[PDB]
Structures are given as structure tokens and as C-alpha cells.
Write a protein that binds this ligand. Structure first.
Ligand SMILES: CCCOP(=O)(O)OC[C@H]1O[C@@H](n2cnc3c(N)ncnc32)[C@H](O)[C@@H]1O
Length: 634
């Protein structure tokens, strides 16, 4: 156990007693609790209703603050202007540290109004989907907030997706517009963003895209399509800086994020406005102990939900200064992350176990010539953190003075679900600890029976909370199928967890067929598809194996079409194929050439033995197992 340090005790917004009192009210009386807590936002017309939700088959319906109206952008910008207009809303640090920016709330608001008008002039309307395929530059934020201001529904696509992966997202969502940049700048190198867009839009099934707006980030030679392609600067300069935000309903859709699942291709996890923003704002405030003047840095990409809730929306609703970093924590040197901390006097740092492990492998090279004294709070997200990593992070980065908040949540959950509160809860290395206000977790066996006491099982949430995803885009029936059918009347997270004698949770990872690779959520089925699309590949089974930096690696058992021979040319080729289908993020670390896939007489693939064998673990046609072991050895 780590005791709460005096300095945090002295300033904390929530102490142990307040966590107990608030947690208990949040469950016993959600309506008074979230009715009061909803006031963290400005409302145009006030809500009367608060909680109005159901996990019942086939009547899954999630509504929060439903008769209320509000604007996300007014809450994240306009309302801070009068008294804090001059406050820095975003600190931008470039890949190249010679390049930085302090954007004030007033500056940010002005550009958001301009871009809101640019979108409106382009014919974009409330409800339209807007694809954003951007690097980590302040214009992505501007684009996201402008979509929100006018009630367009934005769909941010992570910069590292391949042209094929971008096309799929645009096709599913029917995006009317793509907003991108000429190139991205990362670790001295360029991502060819706009080129990738070009390639995407050549897909014949892409039919909805009217225009591409392009930010001139590097000024590289790019192909231009006259009429379709527009420059960011050209358009924004033309636009009025004046814009009045109209009222959106609490349940007006806000964004879609394509998210990997146990079966099929990624689906558009849908979030609405009111409950989402309230949940984002509240979790940020309390979990990071946010006080005016705290300089906050979340290291997550804007193309993931952590970048949505905890780089942008939570921070800006609360009036915080939030830092956006264009680069990677270990470039030019492993000390970079701490140089950024030092340079911008970061007080709250929130990052990924994959990063921590990466800096850890380098030792004191990660902290060398740095100070780190400005830091008060650390945070970790996206994957289980091993105690040793947690210890190194606490000791080396936080100098043994900083609570570490290990925040468990998901894209589908909008905000933090199980998390320490730095002034309320005593820490255990590797534990996400206790549930947040409004959150009712439970552990059930594979049959659905609640497990009591210290125990493990399938992690479910037994009632709704405000930040919960409301649906899957254009497919509410699959939303129910996916999350509310395995354990009736419950939200199934897809994770396993254990609870200890203290009521602390230890999240042990996906129990479905979803991987965590360098903190990216990937379905095994989608990699298998990408593999099988290759004209030389008959059959593939993909499993995860432990990995000291990535957490899990992708290990692919591959069966070639009859008459095909493996080679070293083919190994790299197949890898490059998956990188083309999805992105570098999905490239398999290992390709296991085999004709010995273990199938039931019924045709089922024995995926448990594959998993065990792939992990260096040595104890219809039974003799395939033995052939698989030899092949592994070789
Ligand atoms: C939260 C931002 C990432 O959102 P995604 O929707 O991409 O991933 C959610 C999944 O990431 C893992 N995960 C996330 N945080 C933790 C965590 N703190 N501990 C263990 N596993 C975690 C859990 O397996 C979960 O089902």
C-alpha cells in the first residue's frame, strides 16, 4: 500500500470520506447526485430528467440529462473567455523542440468560430459525419471543437492507419468531408497523410466525400485534386471570426470512434453530448485533482478516446491548460518526455504503460539532466501495468512524491470507470483500485453467476453511468448483441479482473479475442481477414503472446494455398501486406508457416492450444499439436 502524502492530503478536492459519501450517493440516488454534478457545465435550457436508462433485452436505451440543451464548444471555450481569455488553453510542443505554441482560450475560440463558419459555408450541417485524419497539431483540436460547435459528428481517424483502413472508416460512416494535413512530423520523419487520403478515396465504394481540407504542415510536394481539395489557410482566412453557438440536445450524437472488437471489423462507437461531457469533466477534475493553474499533459493521440476525453474535452470544459505534444517520448533522446515536463512545468502527467516500459528499458537515460520537480500527479492508462513498471514510474518520474492514478476504462465507457482518487484512495502497484462515482462493477463466472468476496471473473457493469456510449453507428441491434447479450441486463466489458480482500480491482486483460499491442486494441479476427485477403494465404489464426515492451505481440499461424512455398521474401511481404491493410500497428511480429491448424471434427479451431504453444509453453487429427510444437521450436 502507498499512503496518501501530506501535500496531496492538504489540497485534494476529494478526501477518503468524501469519496465514500459521494460514491454511496451516486449509487443510492443517481438523480440527485448527477443532477447536482451536471452543473459542472453550462446548460442553455436546464434538464429536469437525469437518469433514464435500461440494459434489458431487447430494450437497451441509455439517456442522461435528456430534456436539457447545451453546447460542448461553449463549455470548452466561450465560457472561459470573460475571466480567463488570456489563459493558455493549449500548449503545443513540436517534434522539433524549437517549435512550440501557446494558444490562449480566446485565440482558440476565435479559430474555432472561423472553422465552424468554414464548415457551414462548405455546406456541412448538424448531424453530418466529418472524417479527421490528422497529426498531433492544434488544428486537429480546432477541427474537432468546430464540428462539436455546429453539431456535426466527427470521426477522428488515427494518423497511423493505412489508406485501406481510412477508406473503411469513411465508407461505414458516410463522411462528407475529410480534414487532413500534407504530412505529419514524427521522430524526425514524415507520415504521408494526404497521400494516404488520396489512395483511400480511389476506393470505388467511397461515395460520400465532397471535399478534402488540407493543412500545409510541412509544405511538401503533394498531388492536388482541383475543386475537391482545399487548403486550410485559404479557407479559414476567408471565414468570419464571429459565431454564435446554437443549443444541441444532451442526446445529440457528438462523435464516432471506430473501435476493434471480438468479431468483425472495427465499429463506430457512438457518443452523445451532455452526459459524455459531464462525465469527462468530472472524472478529469477529481481523478487528477485539477486546480486552476495546473499544467496538464496527457500523451495520448487525439485519434484515440483518451485523446478525446483527456487531452481535449475534460481538460477544456474545466478551463485547464492542456499540453499537446507532436512527437514521441523517446525522440531525440529517451529524456525527451521529462524535458517536455521540465520545459512547460507540467504538474500532471498521464501516459501509457507501453511508454513507461520503453523509457524503463533505457534506465536513468530517461531522466538524465532533468528535474521533474513540477510534477504532483502521475497517471497510467490503456493496459495493465506490472508492479515493477509502476514502481519505476512512481520512483523515477514522480520522484516518489506523486500519486499514480491507474485509470481503467474503454472507448465504450466515455470516461474513467475504475480509478484511484489521489487524495482519497491508498495505492497498490498494478491496481486500478475502486470504482468511480456512478459505476457499479461486478465479477461473474462464464455462466453469469455473480462472484462475491475476493475473487476473479468476467468484469461487468450492472447499471449505466453518464459517459456510456449510446450505440454503434447505424446499428443499435449489434450494440445490444455485442455488449448486453452475454450477461443479460449487464454491460460486459470484455475484460477479466480479480477483486482483493479490500475491494480493489486488478484488471488482467481481454477475455475475448481482442489484443492489446503497444496499447492498441486489435481484434484477432480482423488480422486474420487481412492475412486471408493475401492471394497466397489460405487460412490464418492469430493469437497474442506476452511481450516485454508491447505487452502483447501478434503471432500469426498461417496456412498457404495448396502448392505454395514459404520463403524469407514472403515473410516480409506478408507483414507489409498487413501493414497495408490496417497499419504498422497491426503488423505481426511472428509468422508461423503451418498446415497443422488444430480443428475439431466440426471444423472449429482450437485457439486455446494455439495460444499456449505460441507462448513457449510445452505441456480431429491429434498429431497436429506435436507438429505445431516442432515448428515453433524451429
Ligand atoms: C481506456 C482507453 C483505451 O480504450 P480502448 O477502448 O482502446 O481499450 C479498452 C481496453 O483497454 C484495456 N485497458 C485500458 N485501461 C486499462 C487499465 N488501466 N488496466 C488494464 N487494462 C486496461 C482493457 O483491456 C480495456 O477493455
Amino acid at each position: 500500500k502507498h499512503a496518501i502524502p501530506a501535500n496531496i492530503a492538504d489540497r485534494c478536492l476529494i478526501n477518503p470520506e468524501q469519496y465514500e459519501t459521494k460514491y454511496k450517493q451516486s449509487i443510492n440516488d443517481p438523480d440527485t447526485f448527477w443532477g447536482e454534478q451536471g452543473k459542472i457545465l453550462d446548460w442553455i435550457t436546464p434538464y429536469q430528467k437525469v437518469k433514464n436508462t435500461s440494459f434489458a433485452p431487447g430494450n437497451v436505451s441509455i439517456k442522461w440529462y435528456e430534456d436539457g440543451t447545451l453546447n460542448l464548444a461553449a463549455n470548452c471555450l466561450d465560457r472561459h473567455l470573460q475571466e480567463n481569455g488570456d489563459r493558455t488553453a493549449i500548449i503545443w510542443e513540436g517534434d522539433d523542440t524549437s517549435q512550440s505554441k501557446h494558444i490562449s482560450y480566446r485565440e482558440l475560440h476565435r479559430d474555432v468560430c472561423r472553422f465552424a463558419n468554414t464548415l457551414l459555408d462548405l455546406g456541412i450541417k448538424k448531424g453530418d459525419v466529418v472524417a479527421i485524419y490528422m497529426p498531433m497539431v492544434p488544428e486537429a483540436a480546432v477541427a474537432m471543437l468546430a464540428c462539436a460547435r455546429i453539431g456535426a459528428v466527427h470521426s477522428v481517424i488515427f494518423g497511423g492507419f493505412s489508406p485501406e483502413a481510412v477508406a473503411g472508416r469513411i465508407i461505414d460512416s458516410s463522411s462528407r468531408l475529410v480534414i487532413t494535413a500534407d504530412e505529419g512530423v514524427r521522430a524526425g520523419r514524415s507520415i504521408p497523410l494526404k497521400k494516404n487520403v488520396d489512395d483511400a478515396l480511389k476506393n470505388p465504394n467511397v461515395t460520400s466525400v465532397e471535399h478534402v481540407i488540407v493543412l500545409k504542415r510541412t509544405g511538401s510536394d503533394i498531388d492536388w485534386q482541383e475543386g475537391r481539395d482545399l487548403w486550410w489557410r485559404d479557407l479559414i482566412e476567408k471565414a468570419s471570426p464571429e459565431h454564435q453557438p446554437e443549443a444541441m440536445n444532451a442526446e445529440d450524437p457528438l462523435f464516432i470512434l471506430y473501435t476493434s472488437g471480438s468479431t468483425g471489423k472495427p465499429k463506430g462507437v457512438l457518443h452523445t453530448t451532455g452526459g459524455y461531457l459531464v462525465y469527462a469533466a468530472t472524472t478529469f477534475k477529481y481523478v487528477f485533482d485539477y486546480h486552476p493553474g495546473d499544467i496538464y499533459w496527457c500523451t495520448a493521440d487525439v485519434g484515440w478516446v483518451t485523446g478525446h476525453s483527456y487531452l481535449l474535452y475534460g481538460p477544456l470544459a474545466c478551463g485547464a491548460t492542456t499540453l499537446m505534444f507532436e512527437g514521441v517520448p523517446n525522440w531525440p533522446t529517451p529524456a525527451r518526455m521529462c524535458q517536455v515536463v521540465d520545459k512547460h512545468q507540467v504538474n500532471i502527467l498521464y501516459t501509457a504503460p507501453t511508454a513507461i516500459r520503453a523509457l524503463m528499458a533505457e534506465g536513468d537515460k530517461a531522466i538524465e539532466g532533468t528535474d521533474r520537480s513540477s510534477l504532483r500527479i502521475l497517471g497510467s492508462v490503456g493496459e495493465p501495468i506490472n508492479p515493477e513498471a509502476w514502481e519505476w514510474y512512481w520512483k523515477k518520474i514522480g520522484k516518489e512524491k506523486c500519486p499514480v492514478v491507474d485509470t481503467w476504462w474503454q472507448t465504450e465507457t466515455g470516461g474513467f470507470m475504475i480509478t484511484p482518487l489521489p487524495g482519497a484512495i491508498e495505492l497498490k502497484a498494478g491496481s486500478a483500485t475502486r470504482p468511480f462515482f456512478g459505476v457499479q462493477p461486478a465479477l461473474v463466472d462464464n455462466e453469469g453467476h455473480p462472484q462475491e468476496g475476493a475473487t476473479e471473473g468476467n468484469l461487468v457493469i450492472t447499471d449505466s453511468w453518464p459517459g456510456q456510449a449510446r450505440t454503434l453507428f447505424g446499428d443499435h441491434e449489434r450494440f445490444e448483441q455485442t455488449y448486453f447479450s452475454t450477461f443479460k441486463n449487464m454491460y460486459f466489458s470484455g475484460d477479466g479482473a480479480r477483486r482483493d480482500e479490500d475491494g480493489y480491482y486488478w484488471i488482467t486483460g481481454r477475455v475475448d479475442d481482442v489484443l492489446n499491442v503497444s496499447g492498441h486494441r486489435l481484434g484477432t479476427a480482423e488480422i486474420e481477414s487481412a492475412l486471408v485477403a493475401h492471394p497466397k494465404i489460405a487460412e490464418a489464426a492469430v493469437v497474442g503472446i506476452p511481450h516485454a515492451i508491447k505487452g502483447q505481440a501478434i503471432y500469426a499461424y498461417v496456412t498457404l494455398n495448396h502448392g505454395e512455398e514459404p520463403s524469407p521474401e514472403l515473410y516480409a511481404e506478408v507483414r507489409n501486406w498487413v501493414e497495408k491493410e490496417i497499419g504498422p500497428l497491426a503488423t505481426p511480429d511472428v509468422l508461423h508457416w503451418t498446415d497443422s491448424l488444430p480443428k475439431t471434427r466440426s471444423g472449429k479451431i482450437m485457439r486455446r492450444i494455439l495460444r499456449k504453444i505460441a507462448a513457449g509453453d510445452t505441456s480431429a487429427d491429434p498429431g497436429v499439436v506435436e507438429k505445431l510444437l516442432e515448428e515453433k521450436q524451429a
